[PDB]
Amino acid sequence: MNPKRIRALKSGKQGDGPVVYWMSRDQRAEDNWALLFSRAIAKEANVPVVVVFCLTDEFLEAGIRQYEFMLKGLQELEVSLSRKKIPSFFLRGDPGEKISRFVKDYNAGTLVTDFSPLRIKNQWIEKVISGISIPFFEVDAHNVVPCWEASQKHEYAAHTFRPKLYALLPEFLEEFPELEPNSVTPETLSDVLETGVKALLPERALLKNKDPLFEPWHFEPGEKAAKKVMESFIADRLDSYGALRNDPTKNMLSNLSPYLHFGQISSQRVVLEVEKAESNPGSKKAFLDEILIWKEISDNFCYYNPGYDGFESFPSWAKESLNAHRNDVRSHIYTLEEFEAGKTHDPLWNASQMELLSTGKMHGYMRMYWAKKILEWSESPEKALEIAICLNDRYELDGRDPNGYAGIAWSIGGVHDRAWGEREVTGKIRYMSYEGCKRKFDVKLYIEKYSALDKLA
DNA sequence: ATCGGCTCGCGCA
DNA sequence: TTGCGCGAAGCCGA
Numbered sequence: 145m146n147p148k149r150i151r152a153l154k155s156g157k158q159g160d161g162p163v164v165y166w167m168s169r170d171q172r173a174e175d176n177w178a179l180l181f182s183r184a185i186a187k188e189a190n191v192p193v194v195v196v197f198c199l200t201d202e203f204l205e206a207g208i209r210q211y212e213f214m215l216k217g218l219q220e221l222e223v224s225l226s227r228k229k230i231p232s233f234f235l236r237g238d239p240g241e242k243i244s245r246f247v248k249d250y251n252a253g254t255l256v257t258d259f260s261p262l263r264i265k266n267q268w269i270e271k272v273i274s275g276i277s278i279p280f281f282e283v284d285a286h287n288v289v290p291c292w293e294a295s296q297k298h299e300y301a302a303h304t305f306r307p308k309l310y311a312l313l314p315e316f317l318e319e320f321p322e323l324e325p326n327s328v329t330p331e332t333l334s335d336v337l338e339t340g341v342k343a344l345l346p347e348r349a350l351l352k353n354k355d356p357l358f359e360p361w362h363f364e365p366g367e368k369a370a371k372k373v374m375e376s377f378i379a380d381r382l383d384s385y386g387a388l389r390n391d392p393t394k395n396m397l398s399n400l401s402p403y404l405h406f407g408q409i410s411s412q413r414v415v416l417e418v419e420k421a422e423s424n425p426g427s428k429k430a431f432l433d434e435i436l437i438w439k440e441i442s443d444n445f446c447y448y449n450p451g452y453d454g455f456e457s458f459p460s461w462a463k464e465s466l467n468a469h470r471n472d473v474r475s476h477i478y479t480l481e482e483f484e485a486g487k488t489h490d491p492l493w494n495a496s497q498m499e500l501l502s503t504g505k506m507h508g509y510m511r512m513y514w515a516k517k518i519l520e521w522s523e524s525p526e527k528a529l530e531i532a533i534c535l536n537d538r539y540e541l542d543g544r545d546p547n548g549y550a551g552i553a554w555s556i557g558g559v560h561d562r563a564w565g566e567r568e569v570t571g572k573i574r575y576m577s578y579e580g581c582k583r584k585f586d587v588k589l590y591i592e593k594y595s596a597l598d599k600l601a
Numbered sequence: 602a603t604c605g606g607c608t609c610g611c612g613c614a
Numbered sequence: 615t616t617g618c619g620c621g622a623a624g625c626c627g628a
């Protein structure tokens with residue numbers, strides 16, 4: 145293993161007890177550097193490795209769609225891990241409180257966790273550091289190149305981040321070793337799933353006839369299913385990807401984001417498999433740029449800008465520009481609730497909101513348009529930001545993610561973009577138009593697909 | 602230093 | 615639709 149993937153959070157003397165991998169971002173047993181590091185620490189100390197996962201109350205802020213997807217994955221993971229004689233413990237409550245107590249009760253010798261740049265994880269990590277006396281390590285298992293190694297500062301643009309990342313790819317793009325089962329031999333999911341579903345039922349998104357909007361058959365959860373999705377992408381869609389990625393009437397994306405978000409598949413694995421596939425060099429290049437440069441610069445953004453979900457993290461040129469247009473008359477102003485229900489004047493905007501409500505995965509091209517029109521038809525840039533984050537995290541399966549905050553900040557605040565022609569309301573922020581979409585794809589077919597969904601509560 | 606080059610709309614063929 | 619050249623625009627880094 146490359147040691148630059150590990151960072152020490154707290155030093156100390158190893159205990160005589162097991163190695164505890166506090167799993168949080170990377171919910172998978174294969175292709176997982178955090179779990180492979182924990183197992184190796186355990187092997188040379190001659191103790192078992194165990195996995196712990198803390199189910200927090202944050203699920204109440206999203207929907208059944210994300211909760212079920214994640215919990216069904218965990219049910220499959222629990223079996224996979226137990227097949228390698230690795231027990232998994234599912235705690236309920238505040239990780240700051242619960243992880244400390246678990247380490248004490250269970251007499252852990254060493255604590256390991258995976259890496260996320262979101263604020264709340266760093267808050268928990270500092271709470272855990274105060275509650276423990278054993279060594280504490282962090283492993284970047286989500287990025288190909290460890291986030292603190294790729295760059296030491298906020299990267300202004302993809303083209304400044306690209307060479308830094310590619311300079312390190314020969315070193316860090318490598319195969320994964322096998323997870324060795326435990327040799328030393330060492331609250332109930334289903335109850336948790338059923339209890340949480342009952343808590344969320346009053347907030348389910350429903351049609352007029354009381355049927356749920358959400359269609360759960362577009363993405364089967366879990367590690368096994370994720371691998372099939374990757375394989376059928378390489379086999380059927382990667383060749384057309386470069387030419388058709390921006391056409392929402394074609395189902396030509398990898399569809400991997402719900403699995404990448406929950407860590408049910410490793411993007412390093414996807415990159416390995418795509419690198420070795422014989423297909424169109426332009427498609428491979430377009431796809432590797434998205435899953436390497438744009439995904440990992442989103443961790444760069446959140447990790448070096450703690451206010452990544454706020455106006456104040458925009459570049460100065462964009463703050464100045466949007467400020468100067470704060471008093472311009474908006475052509476329309478919608479509330480959160482009229483956006484949410486798809487009640488704007490624009491049938492193409494409404495159709496993308498319908499795709500979001502019913503599938504939980506809006507086409508990537510439409511996310512740019514969707515977010516830019518929220519800025520255009522809301523009373524202020526801060527309200528636009530609020531509305532865009534709220535609908536993104538409530539309804540996207542891949543939401544509550546660095547990629548989301550960075551994509552919204554790109555769309556509304558020009559983060560990782562540049563300045564364009566000055567307009568009213570949106571200032572110098574890059575503009576997108578309904579007529580622009582019409583030159584690029586059959587807008588009418590996309591609208592027609594989602595039209596019959598004004599059947600809304 | 603100093604300038605080439607970055608993930609839209611629109612006219613046109 | 616399809617590709618191209620152009621426009622308007624601020625700034626990083628060889």
Ligand SMILES: Cc1cc2c(cc1C)N(C[C@H](O)[C@H](O)[C@H](O)COP(=O)(O)OP(=O)(O)OC[C@H]1O[C@@H](n3cnc4c(N)ncnc43)[C@H](O)[C@@H]1O)c1[nH]c(=O)[nH]c(=O)c1N2
Pocket residue numbers: 389397398399400401402404405434435436438439440442506507508509511512515536540542543544545547548549551552554555
């Ligand atoms: C306003 C807005 C809002 C969001 C996002 C972008 C924008 C403009 N995205 C990013 C992107 O739209 C999304 O990852 C893909 O549409 C996911 O679909 P596929 O995996 O099929 O894409 P596709 O197969 O094209 O891409 C493969 C992977 O590359 C990465 N990638 C692609 N486009 C990216 C982008 N613009 N930024 C960062 N990484 C990118 C993602 O990991 C994606 O899963 C996002 N993504 C996400 O994971 N969670 C979210 O909440 C959102 N929400």
